Amino acid sequence: NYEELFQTHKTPFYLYDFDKIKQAFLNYKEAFKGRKSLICYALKANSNLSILSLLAHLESGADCVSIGEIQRALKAGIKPYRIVFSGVGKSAFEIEQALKLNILFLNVESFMELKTIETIAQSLGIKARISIRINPNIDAKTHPYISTGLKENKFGVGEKEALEMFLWAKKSAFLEPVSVHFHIGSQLLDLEPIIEASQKVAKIAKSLIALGIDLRFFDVGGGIGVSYENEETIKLYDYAQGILNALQGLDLTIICEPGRSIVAESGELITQVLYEKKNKRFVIVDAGMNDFLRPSLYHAKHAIRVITPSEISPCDVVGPVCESSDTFLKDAHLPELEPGDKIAIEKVGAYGSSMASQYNSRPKLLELALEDKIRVIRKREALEDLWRLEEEGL
Amino acid sequence: NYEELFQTHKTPFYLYDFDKIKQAFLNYKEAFKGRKSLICYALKANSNLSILSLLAHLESGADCVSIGEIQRALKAGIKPYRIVFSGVGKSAFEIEQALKLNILFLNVESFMELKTIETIAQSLGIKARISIRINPNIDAKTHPYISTGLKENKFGVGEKEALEMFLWAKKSAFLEPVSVHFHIGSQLLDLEPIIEASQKVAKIAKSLIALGIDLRFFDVGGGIGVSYENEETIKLYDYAQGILNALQGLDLTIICEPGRSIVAESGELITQVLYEKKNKRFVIVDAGMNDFLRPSLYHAKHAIRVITPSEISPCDVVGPVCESSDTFLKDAHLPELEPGDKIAIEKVGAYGSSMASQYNSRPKLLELALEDKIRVIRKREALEDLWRLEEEGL
Ligand SMILES: Cc1ncc(COP(=O)(O)O)c(C[NH2+]CCCC[C@H](N)C(=O)O)c1O
Ligand SMILES: Cc1ncc(COP(=O)(O)O)c(C[NH2+]CCCC[C@H](N)C(=O)O)c1O
């Protein structure tokens, strides 16, 4: 139905097949039937109000890392008691606001954060439910930038320190430790590191309960990778089976914070061809690194599919921005295209538009959704929106 | 005067010493007195309306890469005849709009772009002034992402193809080739590659004039690096001397498109300390990769200076965003700091806030300027501005 679409909407834009979002979520929801579980969608992947609303209708939870994400989630209909707040840098304002919104719990990453939360909870006269993120010091075997389970990283804390922090939250009248948490990385293709982390944390948890800490949740975070380059993906059946075995003897509600695996595939970046240039061939498209940062930031390769029915040769698919990092795919293989032909960059639903900028003074793109029905879920930015907040200073 | 400042403004924010911008510009303006020259500030570095206005009062020009940047420049007071438009991906809309705004010239990067411009100029009944960017196939010796002078890159075209394109623009009644241009890279510390490029392009230019092409400008682009890590910088006296010698026998107006070297130093990212965390020490600050992308994108190291008068040890300075790439400086050395202490990340005036995003749902920062006088040049974004264009879809 691309024809009606290209007639009423100009490129480049993000297009989301919502069914894939609803099905991916439903798979996590059912992968855990033999137990009580909560699937907290990691907003950082994609926080569009419309998609969050779709997830809310499915009674989804939300893994937030800022007051901004918590506000989005609540505004989209997600129940506060299904909202978890992570973050190594939550500010007093964010802490206070979260406590007043009655979310599930604050996942603390430092002892100083725990003391900060206590002071704020105390002034508000409430007992703050908290979870503690531990760094099981395990290599997730992914890209260094999205690998977070090693001791080298700023996320979570070691076992000894965690044990101390927990005891501390127990004694406090303004803290209530109710959960253990861990997240070793993103875009993970190997299930061993995850399982190893589950066992180690299940051990510390068992230890925690013996010390009086009343745990009610076991949070494994997110991290399951998608098939960007046709690689084999960690099956949910094996994932769940692994975590259930790692939790032997622990009657706790399992929590998953999937992000990428929920929205990646449903989103695609539709962009039009502007020029073809020639030893090497360059296919200049109207979308750029400001719209899609993954390739340059992580050297990520997303598939490129021609949408317009039209001699296949090697070519670099590039955008309009003035930098060399602005090329979507090096040595790609496509048929000769002409000005106006449309192509789609695949699996850009996660960390796609959420990391997008206005670099080179390019307005943020139009975002469309398909619900079987094409509707706008984010209007395109006007040129004037780029400098709206700079006008008074002029 | 940091005290009055921290009393009326909350962190994190960008602070610009405008004098440094005015002096850096004046240095380029005078580095070429023995010749006619035009300094076209590359907006991509920093397009804030206030700074562009300051540059306009100094009769500065503008190197733009989008209609958005051209509009900003014009709105800030830059004369259209001092505006040059580069870009490998200009769309028909941008081309048409530029031609109607009477800018200096369009710097074309492909033969198909040249034909596209011709068709549009023809329909508007005007003779479009154009410049042609050539790829002198020279390694600028910088970071691959900002290195653009190799044949491997999508910028410019080889000599043979350029010669053909020029002849083509000469014959056309809707094109008027008036300039040759080249830009081999950014953050360049070695003056040899630049000079080598100047000589080669000066040769092709001399050749062009012999073929009837009436050249009036010689554009060397930008690219001069700054001292991020106390390295030696290419002096302007040597830069100018080199280009003048490379231009022997060519009476042309020299054009420079400096960006970084104009604004880098004048801007600083003031951020407050939230927590300290401990084998390794982590200094958690309230600014993040969404606000300053350079470290993660280019592995760039900007100096970190403590602003608050307050045992120096090794520590990773990190932001609040959920990613490992979100650390400003690895193994930095700073005194023990406490919640509330202020620090400034140096030389972030270029490609700082212009590549900033709202990732993790964090509003764009407040930008302040000093004019000896502290005034806001960009109001901070409200939480609601993050999802303003998503509300109707909800
Ligand atoms: C605490 C916590 N929970 C869940 C996730 C979401 O993981 P995922 O999307 O299911 O893999 C995270 C992950 N945080 C960082 C993800 C960085 C990805 C990067 N921007 C990219 O690949 O583009 C988390 O921290
Ligand atoms: C055509 C053209 N003219 C001038 C410049 C500006 O160069 P500079 O700031 O004086 O070095 C450019 C450069 N374009 C790409 C710069 C990328 C820098 C990167 N975002 C970073 O270092 O953060 C140009 O293309």
- Residue by residue, what is the 3-state secondary structure of chain A? CHHHHHHHCCCCEEEEEHHHHHHHHHHHHHCCCCCCEEEEEEHHHCCCHHHHHHHHHCCCEEEECCHHHHHHHHHCCCCHHHEEECCCCCCHHHHHHHHHCCCCEEEECCHHHHHHHHHHHHHHCCCEEEEEEECCCCCCCCCHHHECCCCCCCCCECHHHHHHHHHHHHHCCCEEEEEEECCCECCECCHHHHHHHHHHHHHHHHHHHHCCCCCCEEECCCCECCCCCCCCCCCHHHHHHHHHHHCCCCCCEEEECCCHHHHCCCEEEEEEEEEEECCCCEEEECCCCCCCCHHHHHCCCCCEEECCCCCCEEEEEECCCCCCCCEEEEEEEECCCCCCCEEEECCCCCCCHHHCECCCCCCCCEEEEECCCEEEEECCCCHHHHCHHHCCCC
Determine phi and psi for A74, rounding to 5 degrees: -65, -40
Distance CA B76, CA A391 (A): 10
Q: Which two tokens stand for residue B214?
A: 């009436």
Distance CA B117, CA B92 (A): 8
Which candidate, B261, B224, B257, places its Cα nearest to that of B63? B257
Distance CA B140, CA B183 (A): 9
Question: How many residue contacts between A and B have a Cβ separation below 8 Å?
Answer: 262
Distance CA B30, CA B230 (A): 25
Distance CA B386, CA B394 (A): 14
User: Chain B residue closest to A354 (CA)?
Assistant: B359
Report CA torsion sign: B195, B200, B203, B207.
Answer: negative
Angle at A357 between CA A353 and CA A363, to 5 degrees: 90
Distance CA B100, CA A51 (A): 41
- Whole-Å CA distances, B45 to A129, B18, B266, B350, B373: 45, 15, 12, 5, 24
Q: Which long-range contacts (CB under 8 A, 24 or more apart) does A34-39 make?
A: A34/A244, A35/A244, A35/A253, A35/A254, A36/A253, A36/A254, A37/A253, A37/A254, A37/A255, A37/A256, A38/A82, A38/A104, A38/A217, A38/A253, A38/A254, A38/A255, A38/A256, A39/A255, A39/A256, A39/A258
- Only one residue has tokens 């909800």, namely B394
Query: From ligand 1's centre to the CA of A12, what distance in Å?
Result: 25
Which candidate, B329, B362, B342, places its Cα nearest to that of B273? B342
Yes or no: say if B136 and B184 are a contact pair by the CB < 8 Å rule.
yes
Distance CA B280, CA B123 (A): 65
Closest ligand 2 atom number to CA of residue B225? 11
- Whole-Å CA distances, B56 to A202, B32, B76, B79, B225: 64, 18, 7, 8, 23
Hey, what domains does chain A have and what are their CATH numbers?
Answer: 1-17+260-379 (2.40.37.10), 18-259 (3.20.20.10)
Determine phi and psi for B332, rounding to 5 degrees: -90, 170
**Contact residues on chain A for B144, CB-CB shorter than 8 A:** 324-325
Query: From ligand 2's centre to the CA of B24, what distance in Å?
Result: 16
Q: A171-209 as b/e, with b when 16 or more CB fall inside 10 Å?
A: ebebbbbbbbbbbbbbbbbebebbbbbbbbbbebbeebe
Q: A325-346 as b/e, with b when 16 or more CB fall inside 10 Å?
A: bbbbbeebebeebeeebbbbbb
Which amino acid, residue B49? L
| Strands B13-17 vs B175-181: parallel, antiparallel or unpaired | unpaired
User: Chain B residue closest to A12 (CA)?
Assistant: B91
Which candidate, A69, A144, A180, A101, places its Cα nearest to that of B320? A69
Q: B261-286 as b/e, with b when 16 or more CB fall inside 10 Å?
A: bbbbbbbbbbbbbbbbbeeebbbbbb
User: Chain A residue closest to B48 (CA)?
Assistant: A390
B225 to chain A nearest CA, in Å? 16
Rg (CA), chain B: 23
Yes or no: say if A362 and B70 are a contact pair by the CB < 8 Å rule.
no
Neighbours of B188 (CB within 10 A): 24
Distance CA B258, CA B181 (A): 14
**Contact residues on chain A for B146, CB-CB shorter than 8 A:** 323-325
Contact call for B68 and A386, based on CB within 8 A: yes
Three-state secondary structure of chain B: CHHHHHHHCCCCEEEEEHHHHHHHHHHHHHCCCCCCEEEEEEHHHCCCHHHHHHHHHCCCEEEECCHHHHHHHHHCCCCHHHEEECCCCCCHHHHHHHHHCCCCEEEECCHHHHHHHHHHHHHHCCCEEEEEEECCCCCCCCCHHHECCCCCCCCCECHHHHHHHHHHHHHCCCEEEEEEECCCECCECCHHHHHHHHHHHHHHHHHHHHCCCCCCEEECCCCECCCCCCCCCCCHHHHHHHHHHHCCCCCCEEEECCCHHHHCCCEEEEEEEEEEECCCCEEEECCCCCCCCHHHHHCCCCCEEECCCCCCEEEEEECCCCCCCCEEEEEEEECCCCCCCEEEECCCCCCCHHHCECCCCCCCCEEEEECCCEEEEECCCCHHHHCHHHCCCC
Yes or no: say if B136 and B190 are a contact pair by the CB < 8 Å rule.
no
Contact call for B389 and A379, based on CB within 8 A: yes
Ligand 2 mutation target, pool B21, B65, B224, B260, most atoms within 8 A of CB: B260
- Only one residue has tokens 């080889």, namely B158
Determine phi and psi for B153, rounding to 5 degrees: -75, 165
Distance CA A11, CA A342 (A): 9
Q: Which two tokens stand for residue B176?
A: 């008027």
Q: Which residues line ligand 1 (CB under 6 A)?
A: A 42, 44-45, 63, 86, 146, 183, 186-187, 221-224, 257-261, 294, 298, 350-351; B 322-323
Determine phi and psi for B96, rounding to 5 degrees: -55, -45
Q: Which two tokens stand for residue A9?
A: 């909407």
Distance CA A223, CA A143 (A): 12
| Strands A366-370 vs A374-378: parallel, antiparallel or unpaired | antiparallel
Q: Please name the member of B325, B360, B391 whose beta carbon is closest to the beta carbon of A65.
A: B360
Say whether the peptide bond before residue B309 is cis (omega within 30 degrees of 0). no
- Answer left, alpha or beta for residue A299, where phi above 0 means left and psi between -120 and 50 means alpha: left
Q: What are the residues facing B388 on neighbouring strands?
A: none
Say whether the peptide bond before residue A12 is cis (omega within 30 degrees of 0). yes
Question: Is ligand 2 within 6 A of the CB of residue B12?
Answer: no
Q: Tell me which of A40, A64, A315, A322 is the catalytic residue.
A: A322
Which amino acid, residue A102? N
Yes or no: say if B378 and B318 are a contact pair by the CB < 8 Å rule.
no
CB contact set of A346 (below 8 Å; sequence gap of 6+)? A265, A268, A302, A303, A304, A305
Query: From ligand 1's centre to the CA of A219, what distance in Å?
Result: 14
Distance CA B337, CA B341 (A): 6
The number of residues in chain B equals 394
Distance CA B281, CA B263 (A): 32
Q: What are the residues facing B57 on neighbouring strands?
A: none
Yes or no: say if B15 and B268 are a contact pair by the CB < 8 Å rule.
yes
Distance CA A56, CA A71 (A): 14
User: Chain A residue closest to B161 (CA)?
Assistant: A278
Q: Which two tokens stand for residue A286?
A: 């109207």
Ligand 1 mutation target, pool A25, A39, A43, A44, most atoms within 8 A of CB: A44
Report CA torsion sign: B90, B91, B92, B95.
Answer: negative
Ligand nearest, relative to CA of residue A187: 1
Q: Which residues of B are catalytic?
A: 322
Yes or no: say if A288 and A133 are a contact pair by the CB < 8 Å rule.
no
Query: From ligand 1's centre to the CA of A321, what distance in Å?
Result: 27
Ligand 1 mutation target, pool A60, A186, A217, most atoms within 8 A of CB: A186
Closest ligand 1 atom number to CA of residue A257? 4
Distance CA B46, CA B57 (A): 17
Q: What are the residues facing A41 on neighbouring strands?
A: A62
Contact call for A66 and B275, based on CB within 8 A: no
B393 to chain A nearest CA, in Å? 4
Query: From ligand 1's centre to the CA of A222, what distance in Å?
Result: 7
Residue of B9, B97, B154 best to disrupt the A interface, most CBs of A under 10 A: B154
Yes or no: say if A145 and A298 are a contact pair by the CB < 8 Å rule.
yes
CB contact set of B32 (below 8 Å; sequence gap of 6+)? B240, B254, B256
**How many whole angstroms from its chain centre is CA B325?**
23
- Only one residue has tokens 């929920």, namely A262
Yes or no: say if A98 and A69 are a contact pair by the CB < 8 Å rule.
no
- Answer left, alpha or beta for residue B56, where phi above 0 means left and psi between -120 and 50 means alpha: alpha
Q: Which two tokens stand for residue B1?
A: 């005067």
- Answer left, alpha or beta for residue B336, where phi above 0 means left and psi between -120 and 50 means alpha: beta
Ligand nearest, relative to CA of residue A257: 1
Beta-carbon-side half-sphere exposure of residue B62 (alpha carbons within 13 Å): 34
Which candidate, A244, A315, A250, places its Cα nearest to that of A284? A315
Question: Is ligand 2 within 6 A of the CB of residue A357?
Answer: no
Distance CA A43, CA A56 (A): 12
**Contact residues on chain A for B392, CB-CB shorter than 8 A:** 376, 379
CB contact set of A220 (below 8 Å; sequence gap of 6+)? A182, A183, A194, A197, A198, A243, A254, A255, A256, A257
- Answer left, alpha or beta for residue A77, where phi above 0 means left and psi between -120 and 50 means alpha: left
Yes or no: say if A337 and A344 are a contact pair by the CB < 8 Å rule.
no
Distance CA A197, CA A152 (A): 16
CB contact set of A192 (below 8 Å; sequence gap of 6+)? none
CB contact set of B389 (below 8 Å; sequence gap of 6+)? A364, A378, A379, A380, A381
Which amino acid, residue A117? I
Rg (CA), chain A: 23
Determine phi and psi for A233, rounding to 5 degrees: -105, 145
Yes or no: say if A117 and A165 are a contact pair by the CB < 8 Å rule.
no
Question: Is ligand 2 within 6 A of the CB of residue B183?
Answer: yes
Beta-carbon-side half-sphere exposure of residue A390 (alpha carbons within 13 Å): 21
Residue of A78, A84, A182, A355 best to disrupt the B interface, most CBs of B under 10 A: A355
Q: Which two tokens stand for residue B132?
A: 């042609």
The number of residues in chain A equals 394
Question: Is ligand 2 within 6 A of the CB of residue B302?
Answer: no
Neighbours of B7 (CB within 10 A): 8
Q: What are the residues facing A275 on neighbouring strands?
A: A284
Which amino acid, residue A15? L
Q: Which two tokens stand for residue A37?
A: 């579980």
Distance CA A337, CA A369 (A): 27
Distance CA A247, CA A18 (A): 33
Question: Is ligand 2 within 6 A of the CB of residue B146?
Answer: yes
Q: Which long-range contacts (CB under 8 A, 24 or more apart) does A83-86 make?
A: A83/A40, A84/A40, A84/A131, A84/A219, A84/A255, A84/A257, A86/A133, A86/A181, A86/A183, A86/A257, A86/B322
| Strands B313-318 vs B282-285: parallel, antiparallel or unpaired | parallel
CB contact set of B160 (below 8 Å; sequence gap of 6+)? none
